Design a protein around this ligand. Structure first.
Ligand SMILES: Nc1ncnc2[nH]cnc12
Length: 259
């Protein structure tokens, strides 16, 4: 287990990720790297709990100095960001498949009291058999514990993926914030466009969404079956907004498309 660091796979904010190949067995891994001088104990801890085929497999960590090394699964397929052609998206049969695995993944976390708080195509990586993994638990947090649900109030994410409640309320439920970002990943995948800067009332493109002006981009690039689902996801009232159990019922979600 003396790995050589090869290519830089990217840095969200917290630290740099390298591909690391093992000298002797050649097992490829991803090493996240974080300089605790130039929140992060919590990422390790959350990664210790996780075990699903749609979450990036945590392998371990060694401190060894000022740096912190996370040993994570390797997604040779890279980010879902790159399967989205800008302004067109990707074929509807693959869009669905990745949404099935996103939904799978998120059910799992949400079922173990964990919310990601940054679902976005750059944090959905694809492996060798093109399976979607949820990555980066830097902004993750427990919302349910001892079967008590706690509200989050701390604002974090990426504006275009964030839910309105999070701009407009002082505390909010964690599940709906992740269903929203899942809905915006579905928009991205099907239209290849983010629909708005951020879901504020001050924003034309969002005001048009609440006004059901579905004749505009990026909504006119989407078929009425997945478009119906989206209407149910980007509801502005998180108690009105569809749940994951009920997205599993949606017509588009169960429409046969993918071989
Ligand atoms: N686990 C991972 N696999 C591939 N690319 C990554 N970039 C960040 N984490 C990664």
């Amino acid at each position: 287990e003396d790995w050589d660091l090869v290519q830089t796979l990217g840095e969200g904010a917290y630290g740099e990720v390298q591909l690391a190949v093992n000298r002797v067995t050649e097992e490829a891994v991803a090493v996240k790297i974080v300089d605790m001088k130039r929140n992060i104990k919590k990422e390790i801890c959350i990664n210790k709990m996780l075990n699903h085929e749609n979450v990036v497999k945590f392998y371990g960590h060694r401190r060894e100095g000022n740096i912190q090394y996370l040993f994570l699964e390797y997604c040779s397929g890279g980010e879902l960001f790159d399967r989205i052609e800008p302004d067109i998206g990707m074929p509807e049969p693959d869009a669905q498949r990745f949404f099935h695995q996103l939904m799978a993944g998120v059910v799992y976390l949400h079922g173990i009291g964990i919310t990601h708080r940054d679902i976005k195509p750059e944090n959905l990586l694809l492996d060798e058999r093109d399976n979607l993994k949820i990555s980066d638990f830097g902004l993750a947090t427990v919302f349910r514990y001892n079967n008590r649900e706690r509200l989050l109030n701390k604002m974090c994410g990426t504006l275009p993926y964030v839910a309105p409640e999070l701009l407009k309320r002082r505390e909010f439920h964690a599940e709906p914030v992740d269903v929203w970002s899942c809905g915006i990943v579905l928009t991205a995948m099907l239209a290849g466009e983010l629909p708005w800067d951020q879901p504020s009332d001050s924003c034309q493109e969002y005001s048009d969404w609440k006004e059901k002006k579905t004749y505009l981009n990026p909504w006119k690039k989407i078929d009425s079956a997945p478009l119906a689902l989206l209407h149910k996801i980007l509801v502005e009232n998180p108690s009105a907004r569809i749940t994951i159990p009920d997205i599993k019922k949606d017509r588009w979600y169960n429409k046969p498309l993918k071989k």
